[PDB]
Symmetry: D2
Subunit: 117 residues, 4 copies
Amino acid sequence: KCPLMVKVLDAVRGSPAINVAVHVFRKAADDTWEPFASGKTSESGELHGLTTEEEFVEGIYKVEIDTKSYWKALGISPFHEHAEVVFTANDSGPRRYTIAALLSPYSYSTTAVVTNP
Amino acid sequence: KCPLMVKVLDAVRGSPAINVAVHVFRKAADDTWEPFASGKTSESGELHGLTTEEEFVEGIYKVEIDTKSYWKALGISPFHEHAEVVFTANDSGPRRYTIAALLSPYSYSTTAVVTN
Amino acid sequence: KCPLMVKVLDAVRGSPAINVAVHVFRKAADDTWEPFASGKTSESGELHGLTTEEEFVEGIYKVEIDTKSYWKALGISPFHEHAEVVFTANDSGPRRYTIAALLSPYSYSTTAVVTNP
Amino acid sequence: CPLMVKVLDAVRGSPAINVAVHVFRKAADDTWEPFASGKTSESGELHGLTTEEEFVEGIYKVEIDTKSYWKALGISPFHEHAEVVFTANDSGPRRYTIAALLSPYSYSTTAVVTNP
């Protein structure tokens, strides 16, 4: 039951994306993004246990997905260098966040699911 | 000016979809779909002049987009045979309806723009 | 699990849509749709037990998700009566098909995830 | 216009209005600096953000201030903004269109790239 989840899906072949790097940052006092967590997308196209419950604190976060390398490996030239999602976390209180990303060579869509523990 | 507007975009090549057949149906009292309008998407990727405002009477309509034939010509196996959008129209007076489709071999997205 | 499952998410509330009725049809030899399966989305907006491998055979199938009833309960006027997905299935042996739906009062998006079991 | 930003609303089925958009370019030292800024019009579209000569090869970031749009309309949003990062004019002169479909807890982006 990790607090933050990231899901990546491929729309060209209708499969979860594999071997995709994901980076997470936290906004600092100097308005500078400092690294928070990182991971590699599995064959199932899902990440879990990136950040612990205690580590996840109030603030502004950025979840980055490196789509460019994934399409380079498959042999399709992509448009986006990366997809990044910026959101305020736990402003009202502790919550569970899910970030879903549907990927295409020239497009991508993202949604958020927020649930009360 | 057109009461009903349908535009289709391709996600793989970052271009509007070309040579995609579109069919429009209207539900009758017998709960069946009879043809209402048909057309082919232009190179720009949208479908102008499907119906006139007077002919576009109040009721329940359906817009169908032929995804499979578009992918077959390119050489990619498509998951979907067609994409269909059903919507009640002119519920309270005439309006302007816009249907947008973003196509992928295994996914598509649809949004509606309604204005007075 | 099941050869065909349907996941429905709500974009307005950032939650999975609940109490959403789903109906499945199969195209006959005379090109007429017949009732094939039915169900309702759970609190997680997901469908299970909708069809089995023996019954689910090669052909053309249609999945209908009733969106109007969901929005009337919330009190928002919906644009779409329902969202329907039509797909040729089991072209080469049994498979696993995933239909995901992201709903909005005036928009919806769908994707297909096909895997070889 | 080499760069255009289309923003739509999914809740009301109308183009988004009063949304701040800012454009940046990555510098030699990997820093973002302002490139252009504007607001969405009645039709939710942007024009004249940059010209052909000024738009140069590199990495650009397009930001869409969705948070203020939902706060004004009375609903608490999830995302502060929607950011799109891409390489432009790598192979030569091209036309880039950025379309964003906004929702309180979701958004979708597509890019249309054409050769003039």
